Design a protein around this ligand. Structure first.
Ligand SMILES: OC[C@@H]1O[C@H](O)[C@@H](O)[C@H](O)[C@@H]1O
Ligand SMILES: C[As](C)(=O)[O-]
Ligand SMILES: [Ca+2]
Length: 787
């Protein structure tokens, strides 16, 4: 059960299958008389180097702030829209075009089968024409940095086809020396000129004959043919476009063709398997699980295909591996897969939930390497966003708002109502802190500390005293993406808290001046506390203005519940219950990404049954975008890709991290085994998850109860297990009272929440937990059993 298969070739982009090696991507249709591979390279975007800083903002910031405190929010907003933005609002990721293979004589094909196999990161297309069988194997090589397509007829000399290319961009195609060569111009956008070019080269190994035919390349009388597809651009970094794209493309191709095909395949599969075989979720199958995958998606609701949930979980891991690898660019709104020259929201990096969600799987699902391209981006933003901080706000450190792109802009995007939100940089930076919590790597933390610290330094210079309540607050900002431009947003308070407090914790490891550490504490102590309001809800703003029917897709004020660690049912039961009520008020549906966050939310609520209800709200078929009005509840394409709609990859990755959080939590402050297992999943296993403190964890269960767990300690120190059932095992002390000495999965104290006048704050219903301690040694493995 690790393949997606189909009995008809793709009729549209939502039916085609994604492959990629992080840099090159293809979407594969499977068409019989004509195959299409629509291509992408991760650095092919519109525009040039630029920024969207508006220096007018520094002159106007005090006046904007005065008005907000006077309740004149519209006037402040009109002032923001005129002085804080430019004419450029993030450049669009682009398509690289489509390669077509034309099989004119393959008229009446039968016995058709298409798949994508997650075991080995290859797609297969197979069919009969008369007595002859045809088989296509396609993959984007992790080892040879080219896309490869291998085609085999089962009869001698029976293979004849043409290779051609098209693209919506301005392009040239030339056939010389049996090599098809494409050059592709980048694109002008919002008045910014095009500095990028792409090149693509195709060659073919075959026992048949090769010859040109206009701007196509024709193969005749073959038995096997093997296409080698290379491409690259002139991008080096955000302010350097001087590389030679032709040389780059030639070099990849030359090198890839030195290896024979069977070995090149083996190698690819091996390299992929190192990252992919680390983790498996197993849930029981039925006969239903054998059906083709669009049917599995459609019928998931009826309960007879629990294993499908596991398949979608594995798909997220495949996608992250296939879209994000060390040395490259981070996964954008669409991963690396996009066929437009003006995509939805420019297939950019949206950093008020979206880009962060993409990387939730990285640590917990055992894909730590996939995280690197993001840290790499953070170095860039720590420079370009220091320019933003200085020019616009006259502040030290660095900042980013709610969107950035290949050129690493950090200013205010689109318009104030959604864009005036200076906490994007600070949230992204927390991915540094989490990488440390999960790996324990102190060397990493010291390298990246200046960057993390930079966000804390910005807040210390940007925060201002609220005239009435005296708390330090972030203004002007919004709770993404609704309500007015305002001051004391709960989300900004939670992110500022993490920025300051985790900079502090890191400072004891990195080394710092006592005076800078005392600033951090003095600043934390002045931040606003969280609040329970008149509907027993957690307040999104300072004032008690939450609307209990509002089902807005964003729930930005539960950042603290997830992905942060500020709402614990043990430390703060009353607040936890207010979060619960907030979640009931927002409801279970909305966009694909919204649904993905909610699986994590309900996992942190320790409510497996509700989490599984969210899962059922994602696994519903949207056949394609042409039929969205007719299928308005569909959130998964026949691709198994997530639908906002349209296609947005956030939800695939949010879902995967969600299933993990259902089975394992390590943030508060113990390693919690099966914290949110649905009654639906009566029996199964999971292998390979990671807990903070760098523990790898395997678990299996029967009758809705943990049976056995196997925990490897990758770096030693104390392990604290937490469970709903009592446990036994070698060297397992029970513990009551004193907290654990391991800081990595430890939680952190928040300010006492305030309760509104005449509210009697409800208390949550919690299962009794049993906690145990183990003293562990790096490299060793410990087994735990149930009583
Ligand atoms: O850039 C993508 C957009 O980002 C915003 O944060 C969100 O409101 C939209 O639903 C969408 O995901
Ligand atoms: C206005 As836009 C879709 O280029 O950010
Ligand atoms: Ca990438």
């Amino acid at each position: 059960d690790l393949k997606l298969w189909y009995s008809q070739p793709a009729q549209n982009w939502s039916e085609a299958l994604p492959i990629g090696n992080s840099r090159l991507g293809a979407m594969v249709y499977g068409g019989i008389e004509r195959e299409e591979l629509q291509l992408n390279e991760e650095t092919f975007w519109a525009g040039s180097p630029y920024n969207n800083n508006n220096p007018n903002a520094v002159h106007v910031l005090p006046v904007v702030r005065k008005l907000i405190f006077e309740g004149r929010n519209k006037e402040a907003q009109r002032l923001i829209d005129a002085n804080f933005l430019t004419q450029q609002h993030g450049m669009s990721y682009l398509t690289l075009g489509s390669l077509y293979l034309e099989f004119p004589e393959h008229q009446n094909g039968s016995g058709f089968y298409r798949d994508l196999n997650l075991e080995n990161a290859t797609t297969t297309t197979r069919y009969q024409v008369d007595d002859v069988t045809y088989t296509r194997t396609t993959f984007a090589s992790f080892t040879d940095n080219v896309i490869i397509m291998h085609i085999k007829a089962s009869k001698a000399n029976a293979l004849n086809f043409t290779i051609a290319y098209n693209c919506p961009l301005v392009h040239k195609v030339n056939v010389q020396n049996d090599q098809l060569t494409v050059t592709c111009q980048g694109k002008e956008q919002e008045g910014l000129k095009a500095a990028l070019r792409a090149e693509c080269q195709i060659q073919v190994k075959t026992n048949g004959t090769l010859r040109p035919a206009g701007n196509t390349l024709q193969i005749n009388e073959g038995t096997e043919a093997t296409l080698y597809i290379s491409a690259a651009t002139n991008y080096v970094n955000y302010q350097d476009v001087s590389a030679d794209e032709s040389h780059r493309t030639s070099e990849y191709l030359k090198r890839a063709m030195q290896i024979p095909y069977e070995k090149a395949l083996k190698n690819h599969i091996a390299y992929y398997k190192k990252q992919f075989d680390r983790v498996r979720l197993t849930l029981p199958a039925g006969k239903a699980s054998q059906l083709e995958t669009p049917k599995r998606i459609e019928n998931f609701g009826n309960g007879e295909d629990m294993a499908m949930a596991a398949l979608l979980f594995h798909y997220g891991r495949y996608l992250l591996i296939s879209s994000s690898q060390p040395g490259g660019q981070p996964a954008n709104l669409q991963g690396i897969w996009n066929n437009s020259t003006h995509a939805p929201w420019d297939s950019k990096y949206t950093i008020n939930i979206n880009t962060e969600m993409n990387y939730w799987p990285a640590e917990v699902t055992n894909l730590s390497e996939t995280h690197s391209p993001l840290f790499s981006m953070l170095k860039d933003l720590s420079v370009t966003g220091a320019e933003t901080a200085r020019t616009m706000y006259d502040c030290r450190g660095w900042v980013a708002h709610h969107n950035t792109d290949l050129w690493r802009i950090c200013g205010v995007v689109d318009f104030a109502a959604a864009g005036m939100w200076p906490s994007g940089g600070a949230w992204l930076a927390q991915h540094i802190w989490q990488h440390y919590l999960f790996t324990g790597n102190k060397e990493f933390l010291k390298e990246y500390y200046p960057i993390l610290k930079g966000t804390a330094q910005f807040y210390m210079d940007f925060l201002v005293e609220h005239p009435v309540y005296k708390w330090l607050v972030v203004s002007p900002s919004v709770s993404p993406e609704h309500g007015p431009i305002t001051a004391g947003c709960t989300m900004d308070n939670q992110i500022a808290f993490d920025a300051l407090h985790n900079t502090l914790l890191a400072s004891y490891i990195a080394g710092e001046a006592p005076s800078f550490q005392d600033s951090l504490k003095q600043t934390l102590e002045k931040l606003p506390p969280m609040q329970i309001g008149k509907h027993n809800q957690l307040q999104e703003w300072l004032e008690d203005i939450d609307n209990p029917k509002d089902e807005h897709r964003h729930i930005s004020h539960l950042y603290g519940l997830y992905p942060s660690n500020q709402i614990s049912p043990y430390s703060n039961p009353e607040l936890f219950q207010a979060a619960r009520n907030t979640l009931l008020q927002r409801g279970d549906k909305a966009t694909g990404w919204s649904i993905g966050w909610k699986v994590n939310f309900w996992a942190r609520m320790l409510d497996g049954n509700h989490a599984f209800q969210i899962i059922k709200n994602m696994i519903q078929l949207l056949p394609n975008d042409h039929l969205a009005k007719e299928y308005p509840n569909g959130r998964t394409y026949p691709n198994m890709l997530d639908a906002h709609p349209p296609f947005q990859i956030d939800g695939n990755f949010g879902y995967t991290a969600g299933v993990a959080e259902m089975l394992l939590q390590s943030h508060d402050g113990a390693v919690h085994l099966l914290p949110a297992l649905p009654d639906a999943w009566e029996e199964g296993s999971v292998k390979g998850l990671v807990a903070r403190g760098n523990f790898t964890v395997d678990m299996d269960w029967k009758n809705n109860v943990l049976n056995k767990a196997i925990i490897r300690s990758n770096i030693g120190s104390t392990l604290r297990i937490r469970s709903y059932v009592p446990l036994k095992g070698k060297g397992l002390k029970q513990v009551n009272g004193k907290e654990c000495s391991n800081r990595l999965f430890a939680t952190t104290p928040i300010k006492q929440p305030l309760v509104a006048k005449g509210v009697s704050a409800q208390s949550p219903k919690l299962q009794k937990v049993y906690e145990y301690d183990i003293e562990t040694k790096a490299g060793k493995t410990y087994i735990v059993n149930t009583i």
